[PDB]
RNA sequence: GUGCAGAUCUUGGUGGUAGUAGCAAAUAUUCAAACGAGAACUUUGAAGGCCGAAGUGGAGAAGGGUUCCAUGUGAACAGCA
RNA sequence: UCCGUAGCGGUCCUGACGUGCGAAUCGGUCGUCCGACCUGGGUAUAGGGGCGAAAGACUAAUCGAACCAUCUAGUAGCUGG
């Protein structure tokens, strides 16, 4: 599958991919920007802390009306949330990348998430009912998620 | 209603029999374009006239 | 040392003060479960059905003010969880809540 | 599991409501494969389905009045 | 039937708003267990409640047409699951 | 005939709502409630016509002339390209 970014060392790099994932794209982008510079153990621990509301995802671009928490000050930001479903989906995908690395025989504890990006999947359609006999869209915003690990010691 | 007539019940019988999905083996055919049954009907959505 | 049971009394009347009428008995259950988590360091807290009867004995808006509660920390059974020990929380019927200390009962 | 069917058939056999039907909570899997009126009459005989008594509406207070 | 920037142009697609407005009419849920990969919402039991015989009960007419019943699934729908 | 329930209706708050539960609803307060009462089904009256205890009201969310198709690509000294 044609990836967006090629790895600098494909022997020591593994890939994972997911398409048409029923997650909010904006929450997925902000948490992937949080994951993007991390080692795999730190990323797994921080994604568990997001679901347990111990560490937050800073909302940097899509932050309109997003409330302010105390835990965002570790990121140099004021607005943060804890997207649970979005943290679990790219934890399942991170486990898939773990399983793909173990298949290639790469070292488990040296994996650093080198590339990750979130794209917009095709939007799927439902319908809501408004006043004065008007019917409005109830569109979902699913996402494609892409990541590449790299042995970085 | 439960007080049907014979012609109405027979019309309902035919419209019951046309409301089944396509068989699985028809889209292994050579000159085939049908993906699914597009003439399907649900009792809540489309109210069949009458 | 790890498997220990002892009896406390819980003042629901100070753990309850301020919440509305339709949430007083569920808030009393959550406060009993929170007290059990704080006093026995296990996140797995199981409350007895008789204790649920005792809290909900009057109704949803008049919870009993004090209640006598036996905590029993026990080893977890099969399907080994991240929790290693759990806390069984038991009603103890009593007449008066006068001069009842924290009593360390023994098996 | 799911005992929606068993309570309905037990109510119909006992000629009471579903309000009064008591299924055994310990023997759930043995009631869960009954799926018939004839095999549910057996479990009523065996005591795994019990018709609960009527909730008490005492008349003694207004008799006293 | 030959060149578009406009005609509250036509059709189709996509943005900011915006992860915002909102998911607030009719008193209310709680504990334990089972099935399961997964349980605030399924099932069972124990409670606490409501409808309170002009009922949130039991049956019909009109209308609907398989929605009835059994089993399986959890892709899409059932505005959380 | 009076108070008043079910039913029928809709005064006031010019309350709620007003991208609403709703293209007319909801709450309290109200009018009437044995008669010019309420209501189902059947049937009759059709558009310059019906029907009207009469408001130009109603006649399928359409009424000082309903709706559908055609004449019709009606005409415009007027507006926009
Ligand atoms: Mg911004
Ligand atoms: Mg704003
Ligand atoms: Mg709406
Ligand atoms: Mg409408
Ligand atoms: Mg309908
Ligand atoms: Mg030409
Ligand atoms: Mg153009
Ligand atoms: Mg909001
Ligand atoms: Mg019935
Ligand atoms: Mg009924
Ligand atoms: Mg849903
Ligand atoms: Mg009179
Ligand atoms: Mg009168
Ligand atoms: Mg007003
Ligand atoms: Mg408003
Ligand atoms: Mg509503
Ligand atoms: Mg005439
Ligand atoms: Mg009149
Ligand atoms: Mg006039
Ligand atoms: Mg002129």
Write the layout of secondary structure elements.
The structure is cut from a larger assembly and holds chains A (153 residues), B (50 residues), C (107 residues) and D (65 residues).
Chain A: E1 13-21, H1 25-35, H2 40-51, E2 57-58, E3 80-81, H3 84-104, E4 111-120, E5 127-129, E6 135-137, E7 143-151
Antiparallel strand pairs in A: 1-7, 2-3, 4-7, 5-6
Chain B: H1 6-17
Chain C: E1 5-11, H1 12-15, H2 24-39, E2 44-47, H3 49-55, E3 66-75, E4 85-91
Parallel strand pairs in C: 2-4
Antiparallel strand pairs in C: 1-3, 3-4
Bound molecules: magnesium ion (20 copies).
Chain A binds two RNA strands through residues 24-27, 59, 62-66, 81, 124, 126-134, 136, 138, 141.
Subunit structure (chain B): Component of the large ribosomal subunit. Interacts with IMPACT.
Keywords (chain B): Ribonucleoprotein, Ribosomal protein
Function (chain B): RNA-binding component of the large ribosomal subunit. The ribosome is a large ribonucleoprotein complex responsible for the synthesis of proteins in the cell.
Q: Tags for this entry?
A:
part of a larger assembly; 4 chains; D: two-stranded antiparallel sheet; 46% helix; elongated; RNA-binding; ribosome; tubulin auto-regulation mRNA decay translation SCAPER
Could you explain how this protein is built, in words?
The structure is cut from a larger assembly and holds chains A (153 residues), B (50 residues), C (107 residues) and D (65 residues). Chain B has 50 residues and is mostly helical. In chain B, 24% of the residues lie in helices and 0% in strands. Chain D has 65 residues and is mainly α. In chain D, strands 1-2 form a two-stranded antiparallel ribbon. The chains are: A alpha+beta (153), B mainly alpha (50), C alpha+beta (107), D mainly alpha (65). The chains hardly touch. Chain A binds two RNA strands through helix 1 and strand 5. Chain C: Belongs to the eukaryotic ribosomal protein eL31 family. Chain C: Component of the large ribosomal subunit. The ribosome is a large ribonucleoprotein complex responsible for the synthesis of proteins in the cell. Chain C: Keywords: Acetylation, Cytoplasm, Phosphoprotein, Ribonucleoprotein, Ribosomal protein. Chain C: GO terms for molecular function: structural constituent of ribosome.
């Amino acid at each position: 599958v044609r990836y967006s970014l090629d790895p600098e060392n494909p022997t020591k790099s593994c890939k994972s991919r997911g398409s048409n994932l029923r997650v909010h794209f904006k929450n997925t982008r902000e948490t992937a920007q949080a994951i993007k510079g991390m080692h795999i153990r730190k990323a797994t621990k921080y994604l568990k802390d997001v679901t347990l509301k111990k560490q937050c995802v800073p909302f940097r671009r899509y932050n309109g009306g997003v409330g302010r928490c105390a835990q965002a000050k570790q990121w140099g930001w004021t607005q943060g949330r804890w997207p649970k479903k979005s943290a679990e989906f790219l934890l399942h995908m991170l486990k898939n990348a773990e399983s793909n690395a173990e298949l290639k025989g790469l070292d488990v504890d040296s994996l650093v998430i080198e590339h990750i990006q979130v794209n917009k999947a095709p939007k799927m359609r439902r319908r809501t009912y408004r006043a004065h006999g008007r019917i409005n869209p109830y569109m979902s915003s699913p996402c494609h998620i892409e990541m590449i690990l790299t042995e970085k010691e | 209603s439960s007080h049907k007539t014979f012609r109405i019940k027979r019309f309902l019988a035919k419209k019951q029999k046309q409301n089944r999905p396509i068989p699985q083996w028809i889209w292994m055919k050579t000159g085939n374009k049908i993906r699914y049954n597009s003439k399907r009907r649900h009792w809540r959505r489309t109210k069949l006239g009458l | 040392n790890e498997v220990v049971t002892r009896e406390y009394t819980i003042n629901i009347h100070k753990r309850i003060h301020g919440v509305g009428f339709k949430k007083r008995a569920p808030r009393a259950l959550k406060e009993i479960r929170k007290f059990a988590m704080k006093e026995m360091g296990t996140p797995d807290v199981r409350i007895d059905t008789r204790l649920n009867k005792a809290v909900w004995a009057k109704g949803i808006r008049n919870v009993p003010y004090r209640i006598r509660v036996r905590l029993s920390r026990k080893r977890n059974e099969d399907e080994d969880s991240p929790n290693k020990l759990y806390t069984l929380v038991t009603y103890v019927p009593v007449t008066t809540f006068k001069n009842l200390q924290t009593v360390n009962v023994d098996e | 599991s799911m005992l929606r069917l068993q309570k309905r058939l037990a109510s119909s056999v006992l000629r009471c409501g579903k309000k009064k039907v008591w299924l055994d909570p310990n023997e759930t899997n043995e009631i869960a494969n009954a799926n018939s009126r004839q095999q549910i009459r057996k479990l009523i005989k065996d005591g795994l389905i019990i018709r609960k008594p009527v909730t008490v509406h005492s008349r003694a207070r207004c008799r006293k009045n």
